[PDB]
């Protein structure tokens, strides 16, 4: 049934976006004796925070430096500001405390994902996407040998097990391995859903693909409210993996009640298709995992993303049927690129405009994904149509490389978004040459 597969891809998108909320980094600072000890620290907690922690980024108290002695010279207005020396600080060693207002517990607050180990969260996302790549490359022969339903049930079981395991991970490497296996199973079930829907009904192939993409959009929408409802990442992952344990009941239908010629042949077509797929994967998995910086409220941002992406990808099929394949794809790619570039061009104070631009960029990259998926079945003849597999492999690779470019935020907060906006422009300019 198409409804069961739609619920499945909805929960898959929920699991995929769970990393955006569970790895959210709140405003943090390390343990200070004048702020977290007994009442002997005294009134005016802001003054104590100012004299105990030097200023840092965005004119805020430094999230990575603490004063060993109370610097009373910065409290008195008669003294010169920023008069403290660098030697008066310590490398934020006493352990960090986090604000429990928005999120009660996250993977950043649990394992102390801080400035010294700030690369761990993008490294965690990269490990997840590498597990996705490995699973998608491995489930092919497995599904061909053991059948699609067997590997589907095995992937569901693995998804459930790894979800309930990562919900209680005691260490960071163990959590990374659990996410790796969960991504393996996610890629397996994704490849199974794709190879099932591409030949279950099909003339109706574009309709089925648009329904699949609308099901993830619905997944985005659902996971927004799911993350808004529960504040703990453990219970979040538990209640997200429980539907997979429920869908496992359909195992065995209730108990019975090669192709390397793509590189030399059509080289221009295959490199263009792989470039567009790489661009979509890179931009999506680099932008959809850091919604905290793209908007002011992550939940409302995701809700707007979904409610604007639904009609965009709905009319995407009308555009593909009326205007063509290449022109609408190039237009969507250019629109997404220009929106993401304007997101950096607009000042950070215009939060509503930044959120709208991010939503428009996500809708544009989703429409571009729809167009490239439709064009993969037409750019290559039936003799070469593992072109779609190579395109999907290039898209993961781009997804994997996505979070790795986010490390450039040290040189500037706009560089990752600058790349996320510049890549789709060149992608559309290259796709404009398609026949």
Ligand X SMILES: CCc1oc2ccccc2c1C(=O)c1cc(Br)c(O)c(Br)c1
Query: Footprint of ligand X on this chain (CB under 6 A)?
Result: 13, 16, 132, 136, 187, 190, 212-213, 216, 280-281, 284, 366, 392, 395-396, 399
Nearer to ligand X, 13 or 227 (CB): 13
Closest CA to 388 of 398, 400, 375: 375
Closest CA to 360 of 345, 338, 344: 338
Tokens of 101: 């207002």
* Phi and psi based region of residue 232 (left: phi greater than 0; alpha: psi -120 to 50; beta: remaining): beta
DSSP 55-83: B-GGGSBPTT-EESS--GGGTSTTSPTT-
Q: Dihedral through CA 205, CA 208, CA 213, CA 217, nearest 10?
A: 160
Nearer to ligand X, 71 or 192 (CB): 192
Q: Which residues pair with 96 in a beta bridge?
A: 30
Q: How far is the CB of 308 from ligand X (least distance, A)?
A: 13
User: Residue 426: enclosing H or E segment and its boundaries?
Assistant: helix 415-431
Running DSSP on this structure, what letter comes out for residue 289?
Answer: T
Running DSSP on this structure, what letter comes out for residue 39?
Answer: G
Q: How far is the CB of 204 from ligand X (least distance, A)?
A: 17
Nearer to ligand X, 395 or 423 (CB): 395
Residue with CB nearest ligand X? 281
CA distance 114 to 26: 10
Q: How many CB atoms lie within 10 A of CB 26?
A: 14
Q: How far is the CB of 389 from ligand X (least distance, A)?
A: 11
Nearer to ligand X, 111 or 284 (CB): 284
Quick one: how many helices (H) and strands (E) in the chain?
17, 4
Nearer to ligand X, 74 or 423 (CB): 423
CA distance 92 to 67: 9
Q: How far is the CB of 121 from ligand X (least distance, A)?
A: 19
Q: Which residues pair with 28 in a beta bridge?
A: 98
Interacting residues of 274 by C-beta distance below 8 A, sequence separation 6+: 390, 391, 394
Q: How far is the CB of 218 from ligand X (least distance, A)?
A: 10
Nearer to ligand X, 338 or 395 (CB): 395
Burial classification of residue 428, based on how many CB atoms lie within 10 Å of its CB (0-12 exposed, 13-18 middle, 19 or more buried): buried
Nearer to ligand X, 132 or 390 (CB): 132
Q: How far is the CB of 238 from ligand X (least distance, A)?
A: 22
Nearer to ligand X, 12 or 51 (CB): 12
Residue pointed to by tokens 């497995």: 142
Q: How far is the CB of 366 from ligand X (least distance, A)?
A: 5
Nearer to ligand X, 61 or 163 (CB): 163
Nearer to ligand X, 223 or 355 (CB): 223
Interacting residues of 35 by C-beta distance below 8 A, sequence separation 6+: 41, 45, 48, 49, 52
Q: How far is the CB of 232 from ligand X (least distance, A)?
A: 24
Q: How far is the CB of 13 from ligand X (least distance, A)?
A: 6
Are the beta carbons of 28 and 234 closer than 8 angstroms?
A: no
Q: How far is the CB of 266 from ligand X (least distance, A)?
A: 22
């Amino acid at each position: 049934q198409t409804m069961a597969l739609m619920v499945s891809i909805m929960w898959l998108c929920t699991q995929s976006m769970l990393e955006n909320f569970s790895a959210a980094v709140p405003s943090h600072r390390c343990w200070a004796p004048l702020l977290d000890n007994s009442t002997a620290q005294a009134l005016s907690p802001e003054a104590l925070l100012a004299i105990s922690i030097p200023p840092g980024p965005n004119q805020r108290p430094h999230q990575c430096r603490r004063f060993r002695q109370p610097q009373w010279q910065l409290l008195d207005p008669n003294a010169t500001a920023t008069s403290w020396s660098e030697a008066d600080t310590e490398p934020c060693v006493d352990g960090w405390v986090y604000d429990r207002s928005i999120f009660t517990s996250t993977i950043v607050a649990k394992w102390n994902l801080v400035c010294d180990s700030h690369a761990l969260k993008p490294m965690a996302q990269s490990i997840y996407l590498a597990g996705i790549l490995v699973g998608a490359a491995a489930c092919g022969p497995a599904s061909d040998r053991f059948g699609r339903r067997l590997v589907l049930t095995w992937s569901y079981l693995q998804m459930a097990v790894m979800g309930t395991a990562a919900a209680f991970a005691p260490a960071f490497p163990v959590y990374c391995l659990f996410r790796f296996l969960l991504a393996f199973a996610v890629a397996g079930v994704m490849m199974n859903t794709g190879t099932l829907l591409m030949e279950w009904t099909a003339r109706a192939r574009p309709l089925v693909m648009t329904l699949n993409s609308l099901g993830f959009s619905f997944g985005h929408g659902l996971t927004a409210a799911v993350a808004y409802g529960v504040r703990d990442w453990t219970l979040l992952q538990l209640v997200v993996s429980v539907p997979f344990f429920l869908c496992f009941l359909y195992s065995w239908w209730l108990a019975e009640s090669g192709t390397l010629l793509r590189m030399p042949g059509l080289r221009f077509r295959t490199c263009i298709s792989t470039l567009c797929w790489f661009a979509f994967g890179f931009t999506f998995f680099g932008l959809a995992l850091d919604l905290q910086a793209l908007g002011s409220n992550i939940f409302l941002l995701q809700m707007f993303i979904g409610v604007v992406d639904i009609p965009a990808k709905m009319g995407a099929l009308l555009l593909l049927s009326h205007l063509g394949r290449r022109p609408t794809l190039a237009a969507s790619l250019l629109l997404a690129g220009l929106c993401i570039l304007a997101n950096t061009l607009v000042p950070h104070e215009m939060g509503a405009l930044r959120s709208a631009l991010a939503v428009l960029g996500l809708g544009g990259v989703g429409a571009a994904f729809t167009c490239i998926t439709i064009y993969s079945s037409e750019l290559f003849p039936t003799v070469l149509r593992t072109a779609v597999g190579l395109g999907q492999m290039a898209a993961r690779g781009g997804a994997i490389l996505g979070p790795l470019v986010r490390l450039l935020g040290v040189h500037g907060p706009w560089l990752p978004l600058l790349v996320y906006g510049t890549v789709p422009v060149l992608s559309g300019l290259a796709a404009l040459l398609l026949p």
